[PDB]
Symmetry: D2
Subunit: 298 residues, 4 copies
Amino acid sequence: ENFPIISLDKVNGVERAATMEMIKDACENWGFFELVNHGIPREVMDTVEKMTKGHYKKCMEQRFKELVASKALEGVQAEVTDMDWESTFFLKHLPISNISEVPDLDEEYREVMRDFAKRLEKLAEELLDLLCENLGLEKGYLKNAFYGSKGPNFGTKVSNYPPCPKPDLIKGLRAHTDAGGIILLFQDDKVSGLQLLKDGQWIDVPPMRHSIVVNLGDQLEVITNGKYKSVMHRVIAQKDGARMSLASFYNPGSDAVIYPAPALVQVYPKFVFDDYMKLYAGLKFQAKEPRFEAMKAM
Amino acid sequence: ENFPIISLDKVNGVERAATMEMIKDACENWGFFELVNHGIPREVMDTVEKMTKGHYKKCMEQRFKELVASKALEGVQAEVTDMDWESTFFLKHLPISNISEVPDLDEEYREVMRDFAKRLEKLAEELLDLLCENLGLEKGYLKNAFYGSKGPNFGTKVSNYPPCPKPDLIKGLRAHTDAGGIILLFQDDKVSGLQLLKDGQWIDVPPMRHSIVVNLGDQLEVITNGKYKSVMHRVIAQKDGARMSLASFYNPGSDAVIYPAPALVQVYPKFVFDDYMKLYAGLKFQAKEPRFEAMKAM
Amino acid sequence: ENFPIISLDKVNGVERAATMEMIKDACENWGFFELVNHGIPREVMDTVEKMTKGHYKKCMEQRFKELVASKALEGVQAEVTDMDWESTFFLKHLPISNISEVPDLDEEYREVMRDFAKRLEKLAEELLDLLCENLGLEKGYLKNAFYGSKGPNFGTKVSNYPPCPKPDLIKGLRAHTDAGGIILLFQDDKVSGLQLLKDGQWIDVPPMRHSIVVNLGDQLEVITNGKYKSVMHRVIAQKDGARMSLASFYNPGSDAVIYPAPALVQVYPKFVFDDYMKLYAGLKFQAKEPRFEAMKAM
Amino acid sequence: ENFPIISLDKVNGVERAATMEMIKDACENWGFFELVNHGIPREVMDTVEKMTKGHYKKCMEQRFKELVASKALEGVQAEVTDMDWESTFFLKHLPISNISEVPDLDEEYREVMRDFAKRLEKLAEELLDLLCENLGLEKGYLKNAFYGSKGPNFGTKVSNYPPCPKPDLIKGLRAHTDAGGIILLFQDDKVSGLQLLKDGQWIDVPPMRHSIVVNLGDQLEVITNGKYKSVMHRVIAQKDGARMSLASFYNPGSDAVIYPAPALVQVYPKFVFDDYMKLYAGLKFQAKEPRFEAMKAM
Ligand code: NI
Ligand code: NI
Ligand code: NI
Ligand code: NI
């Protein structure tokens, strides 16, 4: 019954019970919701957008000069059509902020991303408390569970990309659930180009200006014992939609022990988060002894 | 007075003198013309288009599987937005046909490119004879001059690409003339996305279905003693234009001695074609003695 | 009690029972043996060696020209010390021979590798029959089990490399067992630079001229139900040892169902070989449902 | 009459005239000399050596983990023999110190390279004054000429590498002169593996412990009007020689106008240093008009 667009300002007013029930429905039946009025000004978001696209334009002009020169060595003229327009870089925020160390950024850009990261962290931890309330758990339970020793892993994937040549090329393309905790996507434009899978069929995430698309990953499903499931999805670059994405991942800390909350109890396993990501990466079957056991299980 | 669109069938009929004068004007004042009715059926061109896009789709599906796997090693989920959609490969035709050796092609594809290359070679050599006539030179003079010992260098750059994220990113992007002989561009769609520079300003090459965009390179300017100049240009991927290009270069042979025709005589130099491409590639100033002389000249 | 050096000519003579018992001991307690007098002339091996090093020298001279040119673009002089001396390429033999398709080889080289591959296949299948006899299995049981539908996967990794800068850099470097069936290593020089792990400690494979170092992989351990174990090992480039390796892998076919032989019966699993290599590669935990089950097992 | 080994401490003592004449001979007839007792303690050099090799060992262990993982995706086991042992990175000192920005270094390492760079700068500027005296020029003339506006380009190439597989592979390998000003090489071991060309034949640079191999580049030849020539040379990794190099280049500033000193006057050209490096890189013949003129000259 339509995608959950949720006005987050309504959670400190008279329409709170409706808004929290809307979040509850989203968490249980969609695994995805779109936030508006979320305590991050348009001032801040447009500043992030303007400067990211500025940095992107520098990288593309630099890339073309290098392409023209490298192609010229082969006795070949580089065209603009030979461009790899894709550019992606990651920024660590927690536990240690890696914005200082990332190459080729303005200082004014670095400051705004430190500010932007601080604001999202509060939003993420606010949302986790709203989930804690809907689930019937104490405030900061999910923040606590995500902490481990050092603290939770938090970071932003900043990517700029062209549109797809034709949509039919993305026909038999593989989808996924996010392995992490909670994910917050900020984009330019209205159109995200993001689809999710509900009851066998693709639904587009509706376009909204100045919105944050939130979704739940595999860890929240383990902690909620299957109640809040991580849903299948895929992001596709639309012809006249978004061409810039800022996916911010708030996952548990490396050494954090993840398990279903005792109260919320067919049964999801107990494990350390780094082991889950080591299974995901495929490092846990480099020795032969693991492999024989896994083949015995299958 | 509008871009030269030239119906090549008219060169064996009553409207020949007009058509040859149209080619003459194009050669002298545009360095570029667009051919229609050129002795290559729509049957053949659409067969080249269909199968190239088929091969492109295989490469992109393969590239995504590898991207998903390689990104997964870093504990990162690959999105479709992370795709490098650019794919380019070259096919040698003359003097030795390298279609047999190029990896990852269908046999049905290889055959059609051998056929397509044979047809373009005849078209290129036909066009060169039409230029020979307009200039006042014997039939096959330009074919002869291009030959050297082994024969002329002929090959096709086959590229598939996405559209540019925004046209403003291609604002301060560098243009060029082609270093070679004569260049024949076949694309999908009507819109080439190709602009050329005439009297300080960009003119778009008009869209035409089933056309071959011909243009003259630096060598024909040397051979014509500045009469047929190689013009500045740049190709840009339009949002809903062409996303496939087949640039076929008919250049002189490596050891071919290029110089202005004695009859057509401020004075263009004499040189071997490989030396020109070695200057272009920047191999001719690796030793210090060349560099001191070049700095003495400047 | 010393590494098993096995003269294979002795298997059709009076010293056969001793030689087969030597193979039995090697298969059970070493997982590794070194063959001499193996039905491949020194004529053939030296022809393989001479031409591989010839092809390697072409690739290195070509690589330096490209390195000098690519570095020159950055205003930097390339030194010989900037060389990546490592060069590796794979040749498929069975089920479909890919020697025809591999780029940048002489025809005389291609022919000898087709011959060399044919000879090794016979040697591998001979050795498998000798193992079949020692185990108490019918002739061609292991060849049969490896077959599947199309046939067994057979191919050669051809690599050329420099020596290690210092041996201490290879101190905390990870070792492994081979995932495949049976592996046959041919090298230049006497010194392989190959060590294997027996009872907690590294033993060098002894140097022998014109030898083939054979070893058993994980699949033969599954088929023998732990009787012939695949042993840990690592190959290291010695300062004045081998600088060329030809590791030939005779593994089961993709769709071959591997399981312990009924007669030889704590219990090794049943599985298709492609699933084992998909676990090895880490493709079998890209979806979330597999991961939750694996974490439930641990 | 043997390579010039020069004790630099002797320039403030009774054997000064002999030592300066030794430098004069080296500058005129060798283009190369080896310094000992040069005002940089063994304390400092061994500290640079120890920590660089430490950083190198971290990079190689990291590279192997990535190699094992990336190869595992293809169903292939990575061996130690598959290692690219080559590792090179550049450090800018003047005009702006880029040691702060270079990734993956210890802070203790960064400090020592800032100290090491400060000491070499003084040595380089000392040597330039000694050349100024031998030539008959005022103190700091070469420092002045190198300055331009911002200051001289100064930086260190820090590289670690394996030995060459066989010396015959480096048979037909191309040599060069250095395009810059003055170059100072510090290595581990005694054996540099460095040869230079004098009267048609290769001479090895003699091995010396704790030495700095100095040589003159193309710019000093222009400034001295051919009197101090930049000599041909090549560095080769010896089997049991040096496996670490620190080539420090003290070149003129980008905008510095280089020309023969009026007093020292067949005639070397006047030019800005960035134009010389743009000719070297091959950027100055991307447009057609330059190319026609260059072919007219030839
Ligand atoms: Ni996702
Ligand atoms: Ni062009
Ligand atoms: Ni192995
Ligand atoms: Ni040098």
